[PDB]
Amino acid sequence: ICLGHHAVSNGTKVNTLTERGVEVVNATETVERTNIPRICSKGKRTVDLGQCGLLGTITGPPQCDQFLEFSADLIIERREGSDVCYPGKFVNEEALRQILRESGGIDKEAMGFTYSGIRTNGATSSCRRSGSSFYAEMKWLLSNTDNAAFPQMTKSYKNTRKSPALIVWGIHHSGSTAEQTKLYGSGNKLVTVGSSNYQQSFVPSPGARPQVNGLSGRIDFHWLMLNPNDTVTFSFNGAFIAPDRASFLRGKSMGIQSGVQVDANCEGDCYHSGGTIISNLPFQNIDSRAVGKCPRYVKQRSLLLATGMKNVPE
Amino acid sequence: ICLGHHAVSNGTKVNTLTERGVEVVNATETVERTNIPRICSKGKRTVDLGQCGLLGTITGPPQCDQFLEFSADLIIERREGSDVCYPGKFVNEEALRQILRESGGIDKEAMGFTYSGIRTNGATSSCRRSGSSFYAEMKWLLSNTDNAAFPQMTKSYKNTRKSPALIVWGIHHSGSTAEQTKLYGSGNKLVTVGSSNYQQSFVPSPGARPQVNGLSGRIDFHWLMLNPNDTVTFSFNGAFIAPDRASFLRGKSMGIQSGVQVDANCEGDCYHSGGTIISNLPFQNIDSRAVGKCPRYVKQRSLLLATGMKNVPE
Amino acid sequence: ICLGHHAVSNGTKVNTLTERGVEVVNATETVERTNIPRICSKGKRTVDLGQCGLLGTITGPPQCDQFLEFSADLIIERREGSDVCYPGKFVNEEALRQILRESGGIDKEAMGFTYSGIRTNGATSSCRRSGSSFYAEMKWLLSNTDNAAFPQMTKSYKNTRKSPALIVWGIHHSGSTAEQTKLYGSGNKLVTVGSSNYQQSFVPSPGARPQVNGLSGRIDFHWLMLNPNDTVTFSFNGAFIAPDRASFLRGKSMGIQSGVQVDANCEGDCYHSGGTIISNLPFQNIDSRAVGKCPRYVKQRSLLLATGMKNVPE
Amino acid sequence: FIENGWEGLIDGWYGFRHQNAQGEGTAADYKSTQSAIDQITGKLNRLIEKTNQQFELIDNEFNEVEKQIGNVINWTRDSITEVWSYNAELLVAMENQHTIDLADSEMDKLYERVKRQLRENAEEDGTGCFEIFHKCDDDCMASIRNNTYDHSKYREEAMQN
Amino acid sequence: FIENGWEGLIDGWYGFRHQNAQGEGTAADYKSTQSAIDQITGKLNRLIEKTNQQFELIDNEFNEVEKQIGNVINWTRDSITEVWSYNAELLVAMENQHTIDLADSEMDKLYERVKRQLRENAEEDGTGCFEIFHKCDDDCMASIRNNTYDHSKYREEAMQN
Amino acid sequence: FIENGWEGLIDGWYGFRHQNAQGEGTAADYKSTQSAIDQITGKLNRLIEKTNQQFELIDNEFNEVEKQIGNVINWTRDSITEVWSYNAELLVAMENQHTIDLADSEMDKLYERVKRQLRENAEEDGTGCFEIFHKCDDDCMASIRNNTYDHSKYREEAMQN
């Protein structure tokens, strides 16, 4: 009586501690290569920002008017998104982006800033709504009558809520010193921001910039995070974009950058710019910068695990 | 004659390459979970800063008067510690903290700065000693008679020692421009700091800040590290807190942040905020941010290693 | 008939999962320790910068006159290298160094800046050539007649090429405010740099610095990277070192820091300051900061892999 | 000594192929095949694994971050990628080695089990087969398979031969 | 074939349990138990290990550092934590597999050693026991244990039976 | 049971040493030595490996970078160094264990092969040697080595003895 094992005519070569190319009866793949070219968002509150930039949701350009108090478990940034309508940029922009991606959305609250002795309705043609407007959450503080001076003002805000408050203000840089005197008056302008963790000063600097949407003017957006019961203080005398509403983080979420469509039919926790990685394999060779709950990225495109015995045919 | 192996009635289930839950005769733990709720400092020169902040030991607020030239192998920061008596902060504060944690202590040396044409005894009520004082290692340079101007001064210091010198100076930001004119005079003030590796400028900026201890004034603390025989130069004309003594690193040490008591009865090289990890196991599941000579942190709370054979009872 | 295995009188002890010191017949080393005290550059376009600093190749001090448009696969920095002839430094210097190390060389292009109403031939004795010169790629913009004012100028440059353009300008900090008035006139000077990704302002700050080569003056070098078809704009009124030629990255390369000689006889892809690591072993214990295509650094100096059987002699 | 495998054994991993005077026979052994299959299944259950560790974005594809912090990030990501590529290759290789050696071990242990069933009534041939010195019919074959063949109620007859 | 273990064998890991006409007997084999114990002890000596690598503080619990550098730090720490969790799980699993297979191997090698001591004077039963064809007394038992039983000075008598 | 090795066997890893009435003889077995050598060679081919991953400079030896980013860089590099030191030590130890067990396995399988060649014409001695009950000459020895010795054309004579 003869006893033995099974075999097949066509085996699968695998690699071991000893050899490279050992035929086995059966083998399976461990490195994921199949990618779903969509953002699988089944069962998740998703906000596709589209033309609205993530940071704009704090300042409120026209393209972000429907994202001022969004709420989401998954935040998607698009390449066509823009944080600004009037040309400018944020200081520490990427840190604020990373803060807002896992914020779970934002909740705005009026800061209650009243003014006496200046004009508060600065607008521009680049921030277009029904006519010429500005950032929805900001206020462009100017002088009263086309020129004359800006009084040294000190405004204070106390965070009365139990979560840190996101405070964003802006320093205006006109295209010339003559335009700065036209808007706020002559003399050296100074904006001072102080709190418990924060201490910092800012001086405007007019000058000619390349024209973006028309201007040739810029706006520096800055931000701090007030702690509960901590008070922030602004001491300004011109070239100041004042915050009208503060932001509060809703909870928790995840932010991704993608250019593929949203699909509520598939579910996935691993995302990259090209889509969603849905797999049970421990490794993947699709995108090393994938985020979420992903298999570990490896450089090998295939690593066959032997699910069968050694194949020794006749 | 029958030969076999031993067995027990109650084995210990472990995990292998094949199964999960294989009863073995004996097993031991590899992931440490027991924590000593104390800072085990037996045999180490320990400095518990308490109410004194680590950076304050360089500037010398009243709470750091007994820490101006400390020496230690282990430095403990407390939550009640404070780096300042007059409200203010350091620039690049965390880098300086990381420098001072492994410094082994500090050694002060008088820089030998003499003055002629200004006042040098600026004090305040927040830095309280026998009366109204200031930082022990600094000097608040003011004007002579309650207002009048500040002469353009240039002071130089050459590091005559073989180790890098820690130089710290301060820029004063008053609550208003009128107070800045009262202390140092009108006009734009400028502080220039130069050496071999350093080049930088500073301009004061008065304005209203939230009141912390009374003021409503701030002080920016800055620092550079002179190399041996390298010379640093300050060119100032007001709003300048001058260094009176420089610091030198003693040797080597370790810095931790904790809120538990110090114990000279137990010895340990792995510390975290909750105490000391004393273990021979290769892994730990207590604190991922533990510092010192620690077992590698893992997310598993238990990984049983089989010290016995397979358990097959009757 | 008796069958067995071979043995030797002197085996090699190795370590296993169970024991430490098991004699085997044959064993080989896995941790590399032999180092070639040279920079093996056989078959690679190599540029040894020598006394020329890497950043200087963009600005062009006298020591970098033969490195203004270099091209290489391997870039070597020396300890005697210097980025400047007039005392000064770059802002974000290490990022620019890392950019230039993998640039594959640089290609300069005239930016075409013409001037009317100022002087453009500022020189100094520290940048010595046939006489007193300046940076080869820069132009020291001054006033016409020994003092009088500097007109508010706005110069623009559009990147007409398909690769990002490296733009470097300089802000001059004289030894005193009187020298700043002598070179550019009285009043607050302001330099504004703007583009699509960039927005930033700069204010000069005169004052006394330690003498380096004679002065006691400094020059801050700044840089941005224009995208294709993007336009950069400078708005200056004094204390401005203008760029005459922009830089473009040639391709790809690698940058190392070393103090050993170059050898075109040996080939190697793993470099460190002490030489080249040429090995097929998977690990090395020579330099943890080695760069290139290296074996993984380990702390063990030796890990013997058993190439033979267990050695049991008589 | 089992110089090759049986491509016609489509019913299981390990089987018997007898040849007495009654006829032919090839039938898989379910309790060893199920053991090796169970162990491979366990390997797949341990390796097919899902992580509950969420990793967030620290880069930016649309607007590149600072060059220095970007080089530190890329450096770290490349290092971790090297580590995970090494771990994946070594894991696959080791698991494959242990799988092959495991199947071979199961085969050998089955062989020695059948050998210990036939005490002196059979002798090893040297190529994985057993020589019976008494014509064992098919009832005796089924008794050999399900481990019920009597080790002494066929002895004397085979010992004579 | 050793379908279970002996819970009453409290004196060692591997032992003998004989049953002739003189009486009973169960005595542990110290030289194999000490081998397996020595190997497990070696595993524990290699795994119970202390690092001389000191790691310093790069975070700050009392005053949070910059948000971007803090996210890079947290990202790196989380990656290293994933690596070490994987290494710990795989290490424990592999070491346990090798420990079990090691004990089983020691048992089998002891079995075949005792088998090679009894050349034709005994026959394998099939369940880990040996059938002696001559009543071996307790002096012969102690001689079997300490590996001194004569392989030919009991032969002919057992070969007849 | 093979209590030691043969230091005089300089021709191969595994060999035969016979002693009949004709004379002496020690000759290596090339086909098993070549198997173990091939497997060790494969291990060396998998471990002697070159990476195509280029790592660039993120530090600066001549002008030290910012202290905080330098501490993050040093922290990460130290962590990766710990990981690679662990991986190197564990890799070497595991590979050595598998190498030793592999050589021992090859020896044992050769032993049982020669045993299965001599079916009842020889008996195991207990120390890795085989007792032949008929004086086998050197032609019979060479036939034993190259696996051609007839298992039944020497049987009856040895069974009588």
Ligand SMILES: *[C@@H]1O[C@H](CO)[C@@H](O)[C@H](O)[C@H]1NC(C)=O
């Ligand atoms: C072969 O492996 C694959 C892996 O996906 C598995 O699905 C399949 O059932 C296996 N087949 C057999 C016959 O084991």
Ligand SMILES: *[C@@H]1O[C@H](CO)[C@@H](O)[C@H](O)[C@H]1NC(C)=O
């Ligand atoms: C905040 O201030 C309010 C004052 O109304 C006080 O009741 C509350 O306890 C404070 N909470 C904290 C966390 O400071």
Ligand SMILES: *[C@@H]1O[C@H](CO)[C@@H](O)[C@H](O)[C@H]1NC(C)=O
């Ligand atoms: C069981 O394992 C523990 C592990 O700490 C050890 O201390 C103990 O001595 C072991 N017991 C036996 C009987 O091996």
Ligand SMILES: *[C@@H]1O[C@H](CO)[C@@H](O)[C@H](O)[C@H]1NC(C)=O
């Ligand atoms: C520092 O300067 C002194 C001058 O007295 C000189 O003797 C010494 O060699 C110098 N050392 C270094 C390291 O520059």
Ligand SMILES: *[C@@H]1O[C@H](CO)[C@@H](O)[C@H](O)[C@H]1NC(C)=O
């Ligand atoms: C012993 O190992 C070394 C490793 O470099 C190898 O070169 C040599 O050929 C080996 N010798 C034998 C006899 O296997």
Ligand SMILES: *[C@@H]1O[C@H](CO)[C@@H](O)[C@H](O)[C@H]1NC(C)=O
């Ligand atoms: C750049 O501008 C030129 C204008 O001559 C245009 O032809 C070209 O398509 C543009 N390319 C890009 C990438 O903007």
Ligand SMILES: *[C@@H]1O[C@H](CO)[C@@H](O)[C@H](O)[C@H]1NC(C)=O
């Ligand atoms: C980091 O790598 C990505 C590609 O993975 C590349 O696009 C990016 O430019 C790199 N970062 C830097 C600073 O070069």
Ligand SMILES: *[C@@H]1O[C@H](CO)[C@@H](O)[C@H](O)[C@H]1NC(C)=O
């Ligand atoms: C990093 O993680 C810690 C907890 O481990 C958390 O407190 C901290 O906020 C995190 N850092 C950032 C920048 O969110």
Ligand SMILES: *[C@@H]1O[C@H](CO)[C@@H](O)[C@H](O)[C@H]1NC(C)=O
């Ligand atoms: C990092 O380590 C190197 C030595 O490997 C040391 O020279 C350097 O000072 C360290 N970095 C910092 C910021 O201390």
